[PDB]
């Protein structure tokens, strides 16, 4: 009964276009394919915008006011979005490829590099009510005879410097009256002019060329004219200038070369501040902060993004995404971290709160097919097509064990026992499930009985039974632990593609090739429910198709499914443009999500392969926090969450229940009534207001009297609220009072409080213990210093 919205895109920090810094300097805007990601450098957070282009973004820009963001794709279709409210304002089609877009520092105008033309437009007014046709064109300029590489605004918004592949830099006046002031073209460079910049006083102009030459232009007498007074050269052996940026206030010049290295220079002295290398791929985009202290670089080939603090030679941000599509994903048991794997063969560990990669593992030679955590959570296992299964200790970030078959079997699926003592893998070529001992690393035995390749495995987190399904049109339940081994095969109408264990361990759901999700009772081994999915799935006609989408049967089944931790929902995805969320007990579709709106991707709408990227979801999982689910796709890891919660969803509401009446009860000191009415309304602002208004002396009284029905919901509220709240002791007092008062009830119903307790344990472990760990170290460090004999 939750509404999920796309929140952020992990696994991709930069694909192409230009990166920009916020005017305050505290945020970085990076194009990620079709969408724009915003990184909070100070708060170490990140979000991705929900709006979406038809194609990949080419150029973006944010005005100095911080109110308007303009993004333009590769065919010239622009989207104007209110940056603060994150809502799209207008769409405009400039009908030409735009290389660069820049706001004037005044913000009234923005300039467009379109072919060999410079278009100046008037910026729409954000404050005003939404206009039907807001874009009015200011001026158009045509001097260049060849495409414009870049453009630069003057600090006073009165002049623009445009550089083109005509080996020329050209200056324009934004006011017609001042045309005589600046109507000059600067020649002299032997290659493409990549950047032209004003000095801070604007008396001097610096032009940079692709060949690696910097010219200093001054207005001087031989009666007065612009002349090259000084010439500097980057003596790169073969590297060419790829991107250049300048900061007039601090006179900093940052140049990124095609060899993958960048230099920082001081002008006009040309003093090389520093020289570093990001790799062997071209540096595509370079940006400078408003204060000039942070430098952002981006390489498109490997999708690297680097924020460099050259003052202290420190790294604010240093991230590289997956080169290939993410094949699998796995949440940490508490939901603090998510592990991803790629067809390349490298695993990356991500932190949910920050959205940045903590470690990358490159032990696997071939594509990693599955990653899974143990119930303990410190250990992670991965299976790969290279023929190995590896165990990773995520406290010390080390591959402490490798499992392999006798004959190098390609593993596609993986399952780990709840006790973390048995690991099982399956293959498309062997038909046998290999079992290893975690402690010893030796093959225990091979579970035989499937006639077809094994598609999917899972242990029950509680019962510890193993379910395996295959293209043999059957599912087998293995009771491997115990003195005797039993197997129970259940027949299914079609090949089984995906499989999921209900968190209770009493039912298993399978997705088949006929587009059916069938739920079976494990103990009785009989079907208990079924869901149709063919009609719900959305699949687009591929450009190469010679048959219609409606007649097409390419992918009308789900290749991956997962239970919600409540057990009442299943999220499903496949080789299609749909992620469907079904309600198991009612067998109805809750909601359908469109994965991409990129017209480039194939599924959105004779020796040589006609192969081009297509949209597909490789893995889905629910967050153990019960607020989000993540879907691994070609573009990256899409995370949908319920954080905003604008919905009004009251519970057991009555006429006498009102936000005013809740506040009245607080003023009357009726804390139990106020808290209950706040939950019945189910308004986050009101629950927070009542929650913090209850005095410490009254908490044990209120906690003891909470009705049982509201107990799971308040426990959920504290766990989610405490993780990011500053009131550590206040939230700890509340948890202790609830646990001490309703501990027996929670024990009687573990499944009902499974997600609430897990969120609480995340807070007590990931923040509360770490605070105490610092405080206790100072206690013992202090005792040693004072109690001990000092040196002579």
């Amino acid at each position: 009964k939750s509404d999920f919205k796309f929140s952020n895109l992990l696994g991709t920090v930069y694909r192409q276009g230009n990166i920009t810094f916020s005017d305050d300097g505290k945020q970085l805007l990076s194009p990620v394919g079709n969408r724009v990601s915003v990184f909070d450098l100070i708060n170490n957070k990140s979000f991705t915008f929900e709006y979406e282009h038809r194609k990949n973004i080419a150029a973006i820009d944010l005005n100095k006011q911080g109110t308007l963001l303009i993004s333009i794709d590769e065919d010239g279709r622009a989207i104007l979005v209110n940056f603060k409210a994150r809502n799209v304002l207008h769409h405009f089609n400039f009908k030409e490829k735009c290389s660069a877009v820049k706001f004037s520092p005044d913000g009234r105008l923005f300039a467009l590099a379109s072919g060999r033309f410079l278009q100046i437009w008037k910026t729409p007014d954000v404050n005003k009510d939404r206009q039907f046709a807001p874009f009015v064109r200011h001026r158009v300029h045509a001097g260049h005879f060849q495409d414009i590489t870049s453009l630069t605004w003057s600090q006073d918004s009165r002049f623009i410097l445009t550089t083109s592949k005509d080996l020329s830099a050209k200056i324009w006046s934004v006011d017609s009256e001042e045309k005589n002031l600046a109507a000059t073209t600067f020649n002299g460079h032997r290659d493409y002019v990549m950047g032209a910049f004003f000095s801070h006083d604007q008396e001097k102009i610096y032009t940079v060329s692709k060949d690696g030459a910097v010219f200093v232009w001054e207005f001087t007498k031989r009666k007065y004219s612009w002349r090259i007074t000084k010439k500097h050269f980057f003596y790169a052996n073969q590297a060419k200038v790829k991107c250049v940026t300048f900061h007039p206030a601090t006179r900093l010049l940052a140049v990124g070369f095609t060899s993958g290295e960048f230099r920082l220079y001081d002008l006009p002295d040309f003093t090389l501040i520093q020289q570093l290398s990001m790799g062997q791929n071209p540096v595509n985009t370079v940006s400078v902060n408003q204060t000039g202290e942070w430098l952002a670089f981006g390489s498109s080939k490997l999708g690297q993004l680097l924020v460099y603090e050259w003052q202290s030679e420190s790294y604010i941000l240093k991230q590289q995404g997956h080169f290939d599509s993410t094949n699998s994903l796995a949440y940490s048991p508490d939901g603090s971290r998510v592990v991803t794997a790629s067809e390349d063969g490298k695993i990356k560990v991500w932190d949910i709160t920050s959205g940045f990669c903590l470690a990358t593992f490159e032990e696997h030679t071939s594509s990693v097919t599955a990653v899974q955590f143990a119930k303990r959570g410190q250990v992670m296992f991965s299976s790969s097509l290279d023929g190995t299964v590896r165990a990773w200790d995520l406290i010390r970030y080390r591959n402490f064990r490798t499992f392999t078959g006798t004959e190098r079997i390609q593993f596609n699926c993986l399952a780990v026992d709840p006790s973390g003592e048995v690991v099982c893998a399956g293959s498309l070529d062997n038909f046998d499930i290999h079992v290893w001992s975690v402690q010893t690393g030796q093959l225990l035995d091979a579970l035989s009985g499937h006639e077809g390749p094994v598609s999917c495995l899972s242990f029950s987190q509680e019962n510890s039974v193993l379910a395996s399904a295959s293209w043999d049109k059957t599912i087998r339940i293995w009771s491997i632990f115990g003195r005797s081994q039993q197997v129970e095969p259940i027949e299914v109408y079609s090949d089984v593609l995906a499989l999921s264990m209900r968190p209770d361990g009493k039912e298993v759901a399978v997705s088949t090739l006929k587009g059916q999700i069938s739920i079976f009772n494990i103990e009785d081994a009989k079907q208990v429910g079924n869901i149709d999915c063919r009609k719900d799935i959305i699949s687009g006609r591929f450009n190469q198709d010679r048959f219609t989408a409606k007649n097409s049967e390419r992918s009308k089944f789900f290749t991956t499914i997962h239970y919600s931790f409540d057990g009442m929902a299943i999220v499903a995805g496949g080789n299609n443009n749909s992620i469907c969320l079904y309600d198991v007990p009612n067998e109805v579709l809750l909601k359908r999500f469109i994965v991409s709106r990129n017209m480039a991707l194939n599924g959105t709408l004779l020796s040589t392969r006609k192969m081009r990227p297509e949209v597909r979801v490789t893995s889905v999982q629910f967050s153990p926090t019960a607020n989000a689910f993540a879907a691994a796709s070609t573009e990256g890891l899409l995370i949908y969450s319920t954080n905003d919660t604008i919905l009004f969803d009251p519970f057991d509401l009555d006429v006498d229940v009102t936000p005013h009446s809740t506040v009245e009860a607080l003023r009357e000191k009726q804390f139990l009534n106020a808290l209950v009415m706040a939950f019945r309304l189910n308004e986050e602002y009101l629950i927070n207001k009542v929650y913090e208004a209850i005095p410490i002396k009254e908490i044990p009284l209120v906690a003891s009297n909470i009705p049982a029905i509201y107990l799971p919901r308040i426990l959920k509220f504290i766990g989610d609220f405490a993780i990011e709240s500053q009131h550590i002791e206040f939230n700890l007092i509340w948890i202790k009072a609830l646990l001490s008062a309703s501990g027996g009830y929670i024990n009687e119903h573990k499944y009902l409080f499974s997600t609430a307790m897990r969120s609480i344990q995340r807070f007590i472990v990931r923040v509360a213990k770490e605070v105490v760990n610092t405080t206790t170290d100072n206690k013992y460090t202090y005792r040693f210093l004072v109690s001990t004999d000092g040196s002579m």
């Binding site: 046709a133 064109r137 001026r139 158009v140 300029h141 045509a142």
Partner: peptide, 14 residues
């Protein structure tokens, strides 16, 4: 000269 004079719904008012 050096200047496109385009009369369109979005510009050329002057």
């Amino acid at each position: 000269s050096t200047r496109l004079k385009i009369v369109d719904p979005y510009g050329g008012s002057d």
